[PDB]
Amino acid sequence: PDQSKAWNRYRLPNTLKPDSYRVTLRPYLTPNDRGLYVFKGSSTVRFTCKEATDVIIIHSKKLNYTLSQGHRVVLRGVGGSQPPDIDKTELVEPTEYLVVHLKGSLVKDSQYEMDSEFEGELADDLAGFYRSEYMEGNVRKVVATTQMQAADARKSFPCFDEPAMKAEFNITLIHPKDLTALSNMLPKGPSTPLPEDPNWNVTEFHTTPKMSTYLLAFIVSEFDYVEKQASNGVLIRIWARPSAIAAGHGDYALNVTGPILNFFAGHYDTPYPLPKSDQIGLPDFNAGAMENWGLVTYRENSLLFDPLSSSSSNKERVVTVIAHELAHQWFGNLVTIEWWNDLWLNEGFASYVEYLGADYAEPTWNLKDLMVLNDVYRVMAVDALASSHPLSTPASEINTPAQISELFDAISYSKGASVLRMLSSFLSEDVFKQGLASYLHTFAYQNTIYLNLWDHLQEAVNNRSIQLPTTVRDIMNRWTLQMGFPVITVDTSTGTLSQEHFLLDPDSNVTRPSEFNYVWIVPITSIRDGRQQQDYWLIDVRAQNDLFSTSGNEWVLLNLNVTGYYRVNYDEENWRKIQTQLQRDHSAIPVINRAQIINDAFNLASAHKVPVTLALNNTLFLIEERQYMPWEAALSSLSYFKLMFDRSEVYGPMKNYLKKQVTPLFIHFRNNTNNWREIPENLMDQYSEVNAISTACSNGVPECEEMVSGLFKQWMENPNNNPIHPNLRSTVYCNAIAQGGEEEWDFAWEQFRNATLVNEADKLRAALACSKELWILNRYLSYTLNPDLIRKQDATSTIISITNNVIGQGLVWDFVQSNWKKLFNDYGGGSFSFSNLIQAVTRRFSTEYELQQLEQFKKDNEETGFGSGTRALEQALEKTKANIKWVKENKEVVLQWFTENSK
Amino acid sequence: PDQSKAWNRYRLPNTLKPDSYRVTLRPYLTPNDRGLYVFKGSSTVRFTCKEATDVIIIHSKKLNYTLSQGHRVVLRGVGGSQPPDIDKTELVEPTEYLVVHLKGSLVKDSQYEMDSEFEGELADDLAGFYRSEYMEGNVRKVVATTQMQAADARKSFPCFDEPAMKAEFNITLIHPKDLTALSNMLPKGPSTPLPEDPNWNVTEFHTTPKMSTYLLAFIVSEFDYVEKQASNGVLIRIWARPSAIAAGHGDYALNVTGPILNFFAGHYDTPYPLPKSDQIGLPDFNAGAMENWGLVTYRENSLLFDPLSSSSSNKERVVTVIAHELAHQWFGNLVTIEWWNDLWLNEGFASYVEYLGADYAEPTWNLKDLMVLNDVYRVMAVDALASSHPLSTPASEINTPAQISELFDAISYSKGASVLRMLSSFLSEDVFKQGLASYLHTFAYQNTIYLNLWDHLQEAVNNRSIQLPTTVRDIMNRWTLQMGFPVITVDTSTGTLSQEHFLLDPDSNVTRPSEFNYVWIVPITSIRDGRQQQDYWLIDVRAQNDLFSTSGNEWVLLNLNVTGYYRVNYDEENWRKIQTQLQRDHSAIPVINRAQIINDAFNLASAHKVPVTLALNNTLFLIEERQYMPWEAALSSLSYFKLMFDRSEVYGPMKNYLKKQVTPLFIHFRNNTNNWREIPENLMDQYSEVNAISTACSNGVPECEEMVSGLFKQWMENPNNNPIHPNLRSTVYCNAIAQGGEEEWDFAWEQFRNATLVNEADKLRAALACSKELWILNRYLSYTLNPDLIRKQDATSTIISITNNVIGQGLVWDFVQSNWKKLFNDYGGGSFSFSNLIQAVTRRFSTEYELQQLEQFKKDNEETGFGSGTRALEQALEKTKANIKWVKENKEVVLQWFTENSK
Ligand SMILES: *[C@@H]1O[C@H](CO)[C@@H](O[C@@H]2O[C@H](CO)[C@@H](O[C@@H]3O[C@H](CO)[C@@H](O)[C@H](O)[C@@H]3O)[C@H](O)[C@H]2NC(C)=O)[C@H](O)[C@H]1NC(C)=O
Ligand SMILES: *[C@@H]1O[C@H](CO)[C@@H](O[C@@H]2O[C@H](CO)[C@@H](O[C@@H]3O[C@H](CO)[C@@H](O)[C@H](O)[C@@H]3O)[C@H](O)[C@H]2NC(C)=O)[C@H](O)[C@H]1NC(C)=O
Ligand SMILES: CC(C)C[C@H](NC(=O)[C@@H](O)[C@H](N)Cc1ccccc1)C(=O)O
Ligand SMILES: CC(C)C[C@H](NC(=O)[C@@H](O)[C@H](N)Cc1ccccc1)C(=O)O
Ligand SMILES: *[C@@H]1O[C@H](CO)[C@@H](O)[C@H](O)[C@H]1NC(C)=O
Ligand SMILES: *[C@@H]1O[C@H](CO)[C@@H](O)[C@H](O)[C@H]1NC(C)=O
Ligand SMILES: *[C@@H]1O[C@H](CO)[C@@H](O)[C@H](O)[C@H]1NC(C)=O
Ligand SMILES: *[C@@H]1O[C@H](CO)[C@@H](O)[C@H](O)[C@H]1NC(C)=O
Ligand SMILES: *[C@@H]1O[C@H](CO)[C@@H](O)[C@H](O)[C@H]1NC(C)=O
Ligand SMILES: *[C@@H]1O[C@H](CO)[C@@H](O)[C@H](O)[C@H]1NC(C)=O
Ligand SMILES: *[C@@H]1O[C@H](CO)[C@@H](O)[C@H](O)[C@H]1NC(C)=O
Ligand SMILES: *[C@@H]1O[C@H](CO)[C@@H](O)[C@H](O)[C@H]1NC(C)=O
Ligand SMILES: [Zn+2]
Ligand SMILES: [Zn+2]
């Protein structure tokens, strides 16, 4: 399309800026004659002309307009302005605009109003204003609900749909008189009967604060709720299907929501300004949750909790997701990104601050620690590629909804959180939260870029007379504007340190230039024989300091508790001292640093910076490790080995090794739990237990295989009296299905179809993918695609579980190659992303044959395009090339190591 | 290359014709300095010039010449002829010629001699003069041995290497004095010491009869033998490695060989003319056996037999292969094909006549009957394709060694045998063998084409005043010169019959024209309610006769005992009467016709001539069938269903159905064998038992799974006291490995590596491919390629066993696509063929995705070419296209049928 025309460009003009809107929406929750569920609406937007223009460009997606006064819209003056007549309108589909061509130009610094009347489908597509469905007995319940993030508000009413186009919104919902209407604000006065039809109520809501379009929510349902006024006076309600509320499954959410909201208000010295915060769980929802201001939406598995059937991991998911959503009330809603390229200002903050909130609510769980695994190490895998991207991408590169959706990724979330964790560490949280309070106060009801944050943190540093090697901006720009992270290499003979950009493939091509030269300013903490030393700042590529020199028996480790976003290598002598320490008394090294030593060495090995046997040697001590984290870090790093080797001669010896390493831990838990009758008191110990069972069974410990098959058989014999503790269900179900046959599978499928608890359905859905029978996986694949059997929101998640199974690899890859066009249409756009699927189906690739298929897949589908999976495909090509070389270099030494160390 | 030059054309000129040869060969059975095993030789060929020519074109492959008198060869006169001087010689590699360019022309009807001195590698390539190796303790034994068929005599000495170039051969072998030299004939006088080195003996053999080059054999070994003069005065010796002979493992061969030789000499009224017939078993051999005149070579599994460890199936293999080889002494050696396009004159005859000989030796086994399964139904699968070929291909189409090798296929062997079985049936064997005696007498020491056979059968018909609807030639040309076979469709309402060319795909393109219009002259036998009717000849496309009309309860079946090479369809009413008969008393229908009803209906269903449920309904009675053959025919037809469905939702219900159908038979055998302590007396009942066990275990009968895993465990606990009867070992080993894990696999691999019995090694080698673990199949694939672990002769056989496993499908197909060039070099030419591998890896293909891979595989390797697998690839493309359509048309009805009938 002609790029010279503004209506063919993806960013809105700067010529017009909205002030406020009124919107009336009326969903029809029964099908029409055509069998369509529809909504009808109207809107008036009041806006200011900032520069003279003869066109109104406004977003509109899948809306049909009712003609009024001869055109798609009516344009009126405000405060005496006299707008031109409308010539014609057009709908421009690629850029998603309604374009109003005028017979003259609007006047600079004048206001106007535009009125529209429209209709859209209330589709089951989880996007915009859409329908969710559930059964209560044999009665079909239909719910009208919304998901605007990022660019779907325009699919519900015409609007200037970019996050810096903030406005007040005056919402009216027209709905069946028996159903409750909900929105961001509370109702304004009473609901009144619709004049034309008293079977409907008209419910107007109070005006919203100035806010972004992507945060609006409109819901019509017959949900029930529980409620409690929080200690800061805000009303909290937890809303869900009536049976869930009556069963008490909203009670845990009610226990934690208000207290976390009040905690954040205190911690950041910034009140929550709205009269209420509703939490609502939807049967059909395409994310964990969404932070709509005043009406936070959740999938059921992230909000509801059944103390008798949900696991401790499920409970942890509920409190952390609630905390993340509530964090956004400050970081996202009150203060909002200027544009999506800086998404981490919303998502990095919510991902970090969620742990502070969850830790407040559950102080005995020690959750803050899990950031090392869930954030730092999660994102370092992709951030070690040449095809990663900076935390803050240049704004001019992010234009289309696909490019926007793509940024909701491990960089924006987990690297955002890691960099904030690092910053808080070197500033102290007291100084950090002081700068944040200032940031929030200054930019309340406005939009920010990354520089605005640094300015306010600088203000706090300057007030506290904190001395840093340079300004906050210059330290943090290194971590924000260029991709990747450094490996810091220590020579303990001389006390020298040096840094370089860590790349998993040495022979990979960094094409994105950095004005920072891939050199960082790095805060370095360290310990010497377990005692913390003075902090150090590495400002250059290399330095020397006696802090890093050792003699005699001494060892040093850098990055205490992995507060910093960097990996560490040492000379081989220091590594040997570390390995000696792990054999002598592993408890002398902080638990997070035991995870670090394992995870760093495996990644260093991939990068050819240490021999692979060094990384494998670092797992030897695990035979007597009882802590969750070091085991989890090892299993996560060895996941790569499984992906590379589970179709090869190396796999037997690998499984033999893991069997040996985990057996004493499995036996410890068997004894300590009084033969699986009890679960450990401590949360991390509960997680350690689950990992010991999972690892024991996956790798062939016979006592584990007997245990899980026995428990599952006992359940089959007593379907309504499940004997398996909730914590153990995922792993018992998966391993019992893997060990069993068609009869176990069919039992679990019927339990899934009949499930009344979402946490229970989820565990079964994953377990069913554990079948070793190809014909069963093929049949299951066909079910994942049938929305009457597996909810559309769960289709790609289940397909990923199938491809993770070694027997499902060929099946799913061939399926994806053969069906890309149709798949892309159904689960690749709108509220959906195919990024996770591309990543999962390709991560085993380690052969030229598979690389050629992947290259051909790219070529064959270049025209369809890959939308929000574009970068995942580039990353898959890079990783596959690295994998071919790594397998060639490592397969013999790894086979020999596992063989020689598993006996 | 320039096609105008005779040395660039594949067929020899007709200008020169050999009379006799002397050849001296000296193998060196220890490596030289270069590490090469070599042979050195000399030859003189005496030949007649038939038309004046200035070039001698003679075959030569991988031979290096020692210059003599200034050139590669010396040309001398005979009987006063005066040959021109040699200008120069060249070796032309594609056509495999030594080309001797002369300074003038040879004279028509004059004789000449050409002398050569040469050297070749005694390679481990199983072709020409090659080396075989075995260990006796820690001593490496090296054997020089030969395989000339079809076009490798030229790889041992220069010769006019085409089968109609018959000559006498005077062989001398120079060999270590301690080793025995063997050839076609007996030694001529004593062995004498080599003058230059008395550590070697020189052994000259008597002149051969006039014979073809592909039948020559030269062997040097320290084998031992057992011997017996046969009743026709011919000396028989069975030669093998000393340990096998001492163990008595040559004894069964000695029991059967002479008696079968004498039987054939009597039956065909034609003496075997040579003084001896040696049978020799080689450790390295690329076929079942080879019929060299006077020195028949065998792989060990086809000649040796251990009564304490070989199965009844193994014993049947030995007698039938010996019988096949001995049949060739008449059909192939005494009388020889003019050219390879008429190969069935050798191979069709040996494949049919083998049963007559084996039945003579083992009259209680009823083997002749197995022709229906092993010949008729084996070949009808490929002969129903548009890409099949006639029994007698036009001679001008068969030129290269690849094209020749390709003809050693189910058409030349099994269709050849089926057509001869049909001919014998309509003539009577008395009249058949009378015409054959005449054929053999007339063409002894000469070469024939298919017309020569008809002429001699006609002579017998005319002598006996047999009346046929036309001449033997005109009846049999229909079965010989066009591909395929008819389906005869009966309308029992009206007594009408009609025929059409049977094509598995209706939408497949027959491109090879037939001067016979794909119309046959068909001898039709029939039964009515079990009573045989008068015979009928269908000479036209349609006819009417009251023989084929029924009324009331009567049924008719055509093709009693399937003597004729045709399929039969009926109107649905007659089919229903047949199905009623099978429910009432299945024994009222001859056993071979129970197999026919099943096999025909399944093939008819594929061809869209009956509904698939009709073919499935024909298997219902199997629940009370105890006979081997109908079960085997059903399992063979349902193999297709397994290939189409074992990666689909249909597979569960299919296995459930087979489980139901086989359980009573399995329980019958469990009881009748006194819990597997005994085996049945009757051979077919022994085979029925094995099939019941195999089918029960494959489809999940729990008593079977427990039985096999129990027996295998008992063996592991007592390795030197195997508790599994030899008949049961293949199926017990495979199913125990499938049910087990790494420990069962490793035990069987060590048993394989340590095997001293070839029959035992073979069963283990197949069983190891039954692992359900992808990593284990991948590791095993790597072993198949290592000649130190699996003998080169067994590499592709083992790869085929892996691809037959559903879990091995993707593995092997991806391997074949990725490694075609190297694979083609190693196992695709010379004595090797890749035809079986192409057929096996592609037979599951039923998707557009797989078709596209196959088409791309063809394109990608068009330049490498596909040699003797060319037609198998064309057939795979045709079948894959048919399979995609068949699965689409049948998957729902088949799923429903198996589901509704398995309960
Ligand atoms: C959404 O609802 C809000 C709140 O009711 C509306 O804001 C109100 O708008 C009216 C009319 O513009 C304001 O009164 C006027 O103020 C202007 C100054 O701009 C003055 O010149 C006029 O004489 C008149 O008094 C009123 O103050 C304002 N209320 C608040 C609390 O801001 C808003 O107009 C609605 N937007 C739409 C598109 O319906
Ligand atoms: C292979 O060995 C055979 C058998 O020893 C050789 O056949 C013999 O060849 C000689 C010499 O040609 C024959 O004698 C001659 O016969 C011709 C008639 O063609 C006559 O004109 C001469 O006066 C002379 O007597 C001899 O009959 C023949 N023996 C037999 C049994 O056929 C043959 O030559 C050898 N071939 C080679 C290439 O060494
Ligand atoms: C627990 C949280 C991860 C839940 C919630 N998640 C999200 O907002 C993302 O998953 C987004 N739903 C991802 C996305 C954006 C645009 C188009 C398609 C998909 C959030 O608050 O960030
Ligand atoms: C029991 C018999 C099948 C044994 C024996 N078989 C054969 O001769 C064939 O298998 C041939 N060995 C096939 C062949 C021919 C040319 C090049 C490569 C392979 C035979 O006598 O026909
Ligand atoms: C919008 O109009 C299109 C084109 O006529 C029609 O197909 C579609 O159903 C309409 N949408 C609704 C919700 O009525
Ligand atoms: C919520 O808190 C109440 C009161 O402390 C407690 O009894 C209940 O167990 C809590 N619910 C959950 C799910 O922890
Ligand atoms: C810094 O101190 C000034 C002067 O007291 C105060 O007004 C401001 O709020 C402080 N800023 C921060 C970020 O603490
Ligand atoms: C791993 O440990 C083994 C055994 O102690 C040792 O021989 C080897 O050197 C270690 N690997 C490295 C890279 O240090
Ligand atoms: C034949 O000559 C070629 C070319 O010199 C040589 O490489 C090969 O080894 C020779 N073959 C034998 C058996 O000596
Ligand atoms: C060969 O025949 C002898 C004598 O009849 C018999 O004892 C022996 O069992 C036979 N060998 C085999 C393997 O059948
Ligand atoms: C046919 O009969 C003639 C005359 O007796 C006889 O010479 C010839 O051998 C016979 N041919 C056949 C094929 O039986
Ligand atoms: C197969 O048998 C079923 C059940 O008797 C019958 O309903 C069906 O018609 C049969 N199929 C055919 C093709 O006759
Ligand atoms: Zn978020
Ligand atoms: Zn043969």
From Swiss-Prot, chains A, B:
Biological process (GO), any one: angiogenesis
Tissue: Expressed in epithelial cells of the kidney, intestine, and respiratory tract; granulocytes, monocytes, fibroblasts, endothelial cells, cerebral pericytes at the blood-brain barrier, synaptic membranes of cells in the CNS. Also expressed in endometrial stromal cells, but not in the endometrial glandular cells. Found in the vasculature of tissues that undergo angiogenesis and in malignant gliomas and lymph node metastases from multiple tumor types but not in blood vessels of normal tissues. A soluble form has been found in plasma.
Localization, UniProt: Cell membrane
Keywords: Aminopeptidase, Angiogenesis, Cell membrane, Developmental protein, Differentiation, Disulfide bond, Glycoprotein, Host cell receptor for virus entry, Host-virus interaction, Hydrolase, Membrane, Metal-binding, Metalloprotease, Protease, Receptor, Signal-anchor, Sulfation, Transmembrane, Transmembrane helix, Zinc
Active-site annotation: 325 (proton acceptor)
Cofactor-binding details, from the entry: Binds 1 zinc ion per subunit.
PROSITE patterns to which the protein is assigned, alphabetical: ZINC_PROTEASE
GO cellular component terms given for this protein: cytoplasm; endoplasmic reticulum-Golgi intermediate compartment; external side of plasma membrane; extracellular exosome; extracellular space; lysosomal membrane; plasma membrane; secretory granule membrane
Effect noted on mutating residue 328 to A: Loss of aminopeptidase activity
Extracellular compartment residues: 2-903
Site (Transition state stabilizer): 413
List of residues binding Zn(2+): 324, 328, 347
Family: Belongs to the peptidase M1 family.
Subunit structure: Homodimer. Interacts with SLC6A19.
Role noted for this protein: Broad specificity aminopeptidase which plays a role in the final digestion of peptides generated from hydrolysis of proteins by gastric and pancreatic proteases. Also involved in the processing of various peptides including peptide hormones, such as angiotensin III and IV, neuropeptides, and chemokines. May also be involved the cleavage of peptides bound to major histocompatibility complex class II molecules of antigen presenting cells. May have a role in angiogenesis and promote cholesterol crystallization.
Name of the protein described by the UniProt record: Aminopeptidase N
Chain's gene name: ANPEP
